[PDB]
Amino acid sequence: AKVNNFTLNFGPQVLRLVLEMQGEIIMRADPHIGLLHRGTEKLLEYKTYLQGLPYFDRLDYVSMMCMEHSYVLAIEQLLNVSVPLRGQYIRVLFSEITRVLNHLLAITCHSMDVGALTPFLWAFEEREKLFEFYERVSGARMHAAYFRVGGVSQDLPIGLLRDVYDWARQFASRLDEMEELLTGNRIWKERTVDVGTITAQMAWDWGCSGPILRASGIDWDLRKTQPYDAYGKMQFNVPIAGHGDCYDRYLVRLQEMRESLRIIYQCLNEMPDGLYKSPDGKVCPPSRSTMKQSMEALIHHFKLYTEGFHVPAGETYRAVEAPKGEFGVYLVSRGGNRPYRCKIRSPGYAHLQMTDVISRGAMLADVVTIIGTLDVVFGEIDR
Amino acid sequence: FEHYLPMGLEYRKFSPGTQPVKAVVPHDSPKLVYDIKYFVRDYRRNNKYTARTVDAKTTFDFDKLYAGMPTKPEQVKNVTRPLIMPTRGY
Amino acid sequence: GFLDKDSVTERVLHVTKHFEKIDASKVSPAASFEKDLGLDSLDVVELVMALEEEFGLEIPDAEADKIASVGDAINYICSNPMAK
Amino acid sequence: FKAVADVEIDFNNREVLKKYVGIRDHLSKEPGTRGKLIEALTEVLSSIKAAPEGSDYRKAVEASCIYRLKVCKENESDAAIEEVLDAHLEELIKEAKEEARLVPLIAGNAPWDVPADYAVPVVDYTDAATILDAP
Amino acid sequence: GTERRPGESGAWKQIERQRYASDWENDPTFKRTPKNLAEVLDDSASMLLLTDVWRGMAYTLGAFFDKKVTIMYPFEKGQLSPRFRGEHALRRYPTGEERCIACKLCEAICPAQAITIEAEEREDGSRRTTRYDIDMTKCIYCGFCQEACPVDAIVEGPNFEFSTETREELLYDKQKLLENGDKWETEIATNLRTESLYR
Amino acid sequence: EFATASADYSIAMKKAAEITGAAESAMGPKEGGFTAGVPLDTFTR
Amino acid sequence: GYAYARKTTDKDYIASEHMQAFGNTQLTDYIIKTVPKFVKMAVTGPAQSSVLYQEPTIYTTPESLVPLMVFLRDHTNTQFKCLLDVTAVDFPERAARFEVVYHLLSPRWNNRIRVKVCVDEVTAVPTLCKVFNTANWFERETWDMFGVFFSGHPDLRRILTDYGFTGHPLRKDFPMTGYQEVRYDYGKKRVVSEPLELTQEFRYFDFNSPWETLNR
Amino acid sequence: KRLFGGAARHFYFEICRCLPFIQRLHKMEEMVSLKELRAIVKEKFKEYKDVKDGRVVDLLIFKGREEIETYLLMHKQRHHVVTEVVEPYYAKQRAVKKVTTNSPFLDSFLSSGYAAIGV
Ligand SMILES: CCCCCCCCCCCC(=O)SCCNC(=O)CCNC(=O)[C@H](O)C(C)(C)COP(=O)(O)O
Ligand code: SF4
Ligand code: SF4
């Protein structure tokens, strides 16, 4: 008959959803966002380039250093700054540690939303180990502010690689005992198989990236097609599935954790000795002993910590294979010590736009599975 | 099967404030300790933008563009992936 | 002719009376909204909405746009088969 | 690439590879062949005649189609065309069909209709390492 | 295992597709039809009598008899490093004179604008502050002020347990920051004896 | 010869300010404040 | 829908020599010669894809943005299938103060491109919702933040700011802290918006050197 | 005949059609009437009666539309209508010819050293 749609309000308690149903089947989904919009793009125009760096830790706060990476690379390209070899290796190693942290949280929060509670509690102790790795090099468990223009902020303390190797020696066993509860379980399969299917044409038309794109049969990894730092030296595989399923994305994310472990092991054995910061003193601040003994270093310390370096006029867009997809910064420079315009491109913003076409024909108990498999964090969505 | 939770002294045997060997961190290159001149390495201020002559009556030959392309599986040449970004020796 | 031409006229005058920008004695049974009473389009829309409130009708945009006089409004209400 | 399925898949059989990555389900269930590529490219070569003869757009499309047909002619197997043009043939047939579809919209817009003294300024970028590093 | 079945499909379009067409037999990720009696019994012992639930149950029962990772706070603590960024503090020389000389570099670098400084010259001619405030509810705990200081006057100490009941208790003035430094001076010096090799 | 800051991105900023059709945009007095959406007493200052 | 997984071996290469040479060197001239009426200005600069290359920037009129984007999506040599973002930049010194910027990615040949349109506050830009499906939310955000009207959009409404929010925050003449602030009133029993008052006003530090040469 | 297609009166008619549902949903039955609400919304329209550009008229109508659906969808409650719509109108028509002979200047003088900002 002339059946009107029944509508539903889904949660003030920070995603708001307005669904329409024709019974038990959804016909429309409209996300209402902006409950975490804090105006960080306006606030970055009132900061110097070093001042605005800790804003990026608070965009995807599950994956911090990867958010820092693209802003730093965008500044370095316009400045024409080269990063030394050891700093590039450190950046790759901590980017892969960051990806492991993000994928642990994403898979276990998804499986908790579905109903399995134990894998969350099993994976968060490994997350605690990697937080200790963040804290030992930056003094902060989450918002490290570690990656800087021209390199990293401090050197690795003596004894870090020993412990990273000791964690990586048992992480595969942890991922194995994680999959015994979920991979060959019929309830998890019946919740995840053929739910929210994405084909390749829809993936490129809807601006998808990351593990969504690899589960639809597309071989596209930015660490292999447009490499940055020492990612071209790294030997690893791109996992590929072909259904576009929630189940296939779960399998791709687990394999990406395995490949991140492989890159971590390679970085632990090829870590070179040398400088970790670029030797251009007009961009990178001097060491604290040098500042207390030479006049030029003290002048450069004074000026770099007040006015900051001046970026030459121009523009660039630089992107990083963040663990949720492509994270990019569009930096517009007029020539000052402050960004003229800093647009932030987030993958979860594009992934959440698809919920109207992905939830069609699904039921109410599959909305939370779709939201969980898109891997969304509203700090980067709502800038 | 590797066990989670290692026992005593098998993980983080020394605290980071009691490092058993003193650390000597390089903060400058040996090439720049006594050779300090800057204008030979001022990459920031030496880039240029040049206005091209007005792209109107140029000759785009498509024959040359498609004459350098292969037609057989062998004789296909691929650009290798760059191993590292430029470090300029440091 | 669905309703009389006197009671509708005094009801029209009664709702025209309570307008702050109108004169309570200048209102005549046969006047104009533009030249005589001095009203723009939004005032005309407000007066037609008051007439709709009093007689319990619905006048569309084109029909209310054609109404330009007190006599036009009275004739439109009288010609309406659903008046109250 | 790495296959996330725990079963052993051959992937030397090209039809199995086209099944596994979702080409059959999501792009084209009918297998694309060399003859369909030739037919689609000749459709483009017929469709481009709506553009003027002197236009660079027509020359560009015609040269691309002629090169694609020469690759199709000098290679008999479809794996050879895959290795030369760096795609699956289903992708290449879709490319040719999209290029043929593009022509009436461009022809309706007529980008070639500029005045004789048309001018476009271009600004190019020169790196510092051109003049600082060794020649 | 990651294999698929006709019937275990979570949606309806694929459920309708698998029961009306044999397109799923071409896909290599599907489990094939059993061919003889023993394979039928294996498939039925997979579907009926569970045995996939039981593997997870055996793993969680093994975890029931395993070791635990809980620490008994506040009798036991976690693990931190000398670089840890905690409660801000103001430092002195061993003589007892303040290190701070009112250069206003930490106030300039602060991205949160959490520092407010006023100064004049002391009665002996020295350059010293008269006001040094840190809004701890505006602070982001980045440590940039610690980096900008050329005389090691402002630090972030090793204290993280400083929650209060009123917000006015978290607007620190100069006297409280000096009191924090006088409390934590030996630990701060022990931390800085290691971290000066790197900074 | 012409060389007035002819080695930086400001060449690409001076043009893109003189693109035709966009170099002749004009509004009436006080009109941009009506569409700005900020309170109207701000323009009494 | 491109970049399907085809090689089962590890690939140690990015692109082919001839297509990478064409994309990194000849693409600006190619786009200018094939569709000259669409292009009004071009910049070839420091390359969104990598630090080692150069990549073009195309300036176009709003009257031909949709045909140019359709050409850049569907032409056989420029297969720009992915639209990464739409944004704006404010230049208050210009007659047309806004530059709407479109970034694109070509998975077929590992390329990127940038497309710009210059408009003022009262000139509409045609929507790209029919060309790219992500153009919806980005155009909604651009309207929210800058006040650029996108004609032909299905539902152009604000997406990021507060419910009653008038004003476009990313303009240069909009204040950083705004005009209104929010508190709970015990008498009205409602959360109420009030004119702005600050306990400590924002301190603006003017650091800029009078010897600095780079300011443009 | 009516400038710029008569779009101001068409939008005014649309809002006046929308108004009784606003009064029922926001429960403003005993606070304001439909006649005074129509007069208030009419007074919102007269403030831009001297706009000489049709594109500014179209933008103003689009923005007023988005205001009317954020009132329709209960994204602003009755206290928002009170503090933003009807009390500014009643303040602009209540202070006219006050009971005191003080000029506006002298009231401003006795209030503060500077003019008031906002409402
Ligand atoms: C719940 C409350 C929410 C209300 C929000 C909605 C408020 C919307 C208000 C904004 C809409 C506008 O102003 S729309 C802008 C209106 N101004 C113009 O269009 C410029 C031309 N001037 C006119 O049209 C005049 O009305 C006139 C000279 C009298 C023409 O006489 P007539 O009339 O005879 O035709
Ligand atoms: S730690 Fe950061 S937020 Fe705290 S006072 Fe120092 S610079 Fe400011
Ligand atoms: S604490 Fe250090 S940086 Fe801050 S004003 Fe005092 S001396 Fe300067």
PDB file of N, CA and C in Angstrom, chain H residues 26-52:
ATOM      1  N   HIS H  26       5.838  24.699  19.150  1.00  0.00           N
ATOM      2  CA  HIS H  26       6.591  25.385  20.189  1.00  0.00           C
ATOM      3  C   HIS H  26       5.727  25.814  21.364  1.00  0.00           C
ATOM      4  N   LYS H  27       4.418  25.533  21.313  1.00  0.00           N
ATOM      5  CA  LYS H  27       3.479  25.751  22.417  1.00  0.00           C
ATOM      6  C   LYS H  27       3.407  27.227  22.796  1.00  0.00           C
ATOM      7  N   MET H  28       3.426  28.089  21.782  1.00  0.00           N
ATOM      8  CA  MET H  28       3.351  29.531  21.958  1.00  0.00           C
ATOM      9  C   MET H  28       1.927  30.052  21.818  1.00  0.00           C
ATOM     10  N   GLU H  29       0.941  29.234  22.187  1.00  0.00           N
ATOM     11  CA  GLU H  29      -0.458  29.602  22.004  1.00  0.00           C
ATOM     12  C   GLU H  29      -0.875  30.747  22.919  1.00  0.00           C
ATOM     13  N   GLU H  30      -0.373  30.773  24.151  1.00  0.00           N
ATOM     14  CA  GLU H  30      -0.744  31.796  25.119  1.00  0.00           C
ATOM     15  C   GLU H  30       0.331  32.865  25.283  1.00  0.00           C
ATOM     16  N   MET H  31       1.376  32.844  24.457  1.00  0.00           N
ATOM     17  CA  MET H  31       2.429  33.851  24.521  1.00  0.00           C
ATOM     18  C   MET H  31       2.296  34.908  23.434  1.00  0.00           C
ATOM     19  N   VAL H  32       2.207  34.492  22.170  1.00  0.00           N
ATOM     20  CA  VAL H  32       1.958  35.404  21.064  1.00  0.00           C
ATOM     21  C   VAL H  32       0.867  34.823  20.178  1.00  0.00           C
ATOM     22  N   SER H  33       0.247  35.699  19.403  1.00  0.00           N
ATOM     23  CA  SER H  33      -0.779  35.307  18.453  1.00  0.00           C
ATOM     24  C   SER H  33      -0.186  35.216  17.054  1.00  0.00           C
ATOM     25  N   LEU H  34      -0.992  34.705  16.125  1.00  0.00           N
ATOM     26  CA  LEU H  34      -0.539  34.589  14.746  1.00  0.00           C
ATOM     27  C   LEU H  34      -0.488  35.941  14.054  1.00  0.00           C
ATOM     28  N   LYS H  35      -1.358  36.876  14.445  1.00  0.00           N
ATOM     29  CA  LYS H  35      -1.364  38.196  13.820  1.00  0.00           C
ATOM     30  C   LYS H  35      -0.099  38.970  14.166  1.00  0.00           C
ATOM     31  N   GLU H  36       0.275  38.979  15.448  1.00  0.00           N
ATOM     32  CA  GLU H  36       1.487  39.683  15.843  1.00  0.00           C
ATOM     33  C   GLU H  36       2.735  38.967  15.348  1.00  0.00           C
ATOM     34  N   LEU H  37       2.702  37.632  15.263  1.00  0.00           N
ATOM     35  CA  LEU H  37       3.818  36.889  14.683  1.00  0.00           C
ATOM     36  C   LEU H  37       3.998  37.222  13.210  1.00  0.00           C
ATOM     37  N   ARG H  38       2.890  37.328  12.470  1.00  0.00           N
ATOM     38  CA  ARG H  38       2.958  37.715  11.066  1.00  0.00           C
ATOM     39  C   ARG H  38       3.493  39.130  10.914  1.00  0.00           C
ATOM     40  N   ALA H  39       3.086  40.035  11.811  1.00  0.00           N
ATOM     41  CA  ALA H  39       3.610  41.399  11.792  1.00  0.00           C
ATOM     42  C   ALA H  39       5.105  41.435  12.106  1.00  0.00           C
ATOM     43  N   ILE H  40       5.562  40.578  13.024  1.00  0.00           N
ATOM     44  CA  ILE H  40       6.981  40.521  13.382  1.00  0.00           C
ATOM     45  C   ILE H  40       7.812  40.012  12.210  1.00  0.00           C
ATOM     46  N   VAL H  41       7.363  38.925  11.576  1.00  0.00           N
ATOM     47  CA  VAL H  41       8.080  38.373  10.429  1.00  0.00           C
ATOM     48  C   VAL H  41       8.043  39.348   9.259  1.00  0.00           C
ATOM     49  N   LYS H  42       6.948  40.098   9.119  1.00  0.00           N
ATOM     50  CA  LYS H  42       6.905  41.185   8.148  1.00  0.00           C
ATOM     51  C   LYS H  42       7.939  42.256   8.472  1.00  0.00           C
ATOM     52  N   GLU H  43       8.143  42.540   9.758  1.00  0.00           N
ATOM     53  CA  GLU H  43       9.131  43.539  10.142  1.00  0.00           C
ATOM     54  C   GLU H  43      10.556  43.039   9.939  1.00  0.00           C
ATOM     55  N   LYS H  44      10.756  41.719   9.914  1.00  0.00           N
ATOM     56  CA  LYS H  44      12.066  41.186   9.550  1.00  0.00           C
ATOM     57  C   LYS H  44      12.361  41.420   8.073  1.00  0.00           C
ATOM     58  N   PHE H  45      11.315  41.461   7.246  1.00  0.00           N
ATOM     59  CA  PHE H  45      11.493  41.569   5.803  1.00  0.00           C
ATOM     60  C   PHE H  45      11.788  43.002   5.374  1.00  0.00           C
ATOM     61  N   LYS H  46      11.240  43.988   6.093  1.00  0.00           N
ATOM     62  CA  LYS H  46      11.378  45.386   5.695  1.00  0.00           C
ATOM     63  C   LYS H  46      12.788  45.918   5.907  1.00  0.00           C
ATOM     64  N   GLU H  47      13.599  45.233   6.714  1.00  0.00           N
ATOM     65  CA  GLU H  47      14.952  45.691   7.000  1.00  0.00           C
ATOM     66  C   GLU H  47      15.846  45.621   5.771  1.00  0.00           C
ATOM     67  N   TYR H  48      15.521  44.752   4.819  1.00  0.00           N
ATOM     68  CA  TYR H  48      16.253  44.628   3.567  1.00  0.00           C
ATOM     69  C   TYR H  48      15.400  45.062   2.382  1.00  0.00           C
ATOM     70  N   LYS H  49      14.538  46.059   2.586  1.00  0.00           N
ATOM     71  CA  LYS H  49      13.673  46.530   1.511  1.00  0.00           C
ATOM     72  C   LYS H  49      14.415  47.355   0.470  1.00  0.00           C
ATOM     73  N   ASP H  50      15.639  47.788   0.765  1.00  0.00           N
ATOM     74  CA  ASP H  50      16.414  48.640  -0.121  1.00  0.00           C
ATOM     75  C   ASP H  50      17.591  47.898  -0.747  1.00  0.00           C
ATOM     76  N   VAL H  51      17.477  46.584  -0.897  1.00  0.00           N
ATOM     77  CA  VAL H  51      18.511  45.801  -1.566  1.00  0.00           C
ATOM     78  C   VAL H  51      18.326  45.958  -3.068  1.00  0.00           C
ATOM     79  N   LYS H  52      19.382  46.377  -3.757  1.00  0.00           N
ATOM     80  CA  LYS H  52      19.320  46.668  -5.181  1.00  0.00           C
ATOM     81  C   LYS H  52      19.799  45.520  -6.060  1.00  0.00           C
TER      82      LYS H  52
END
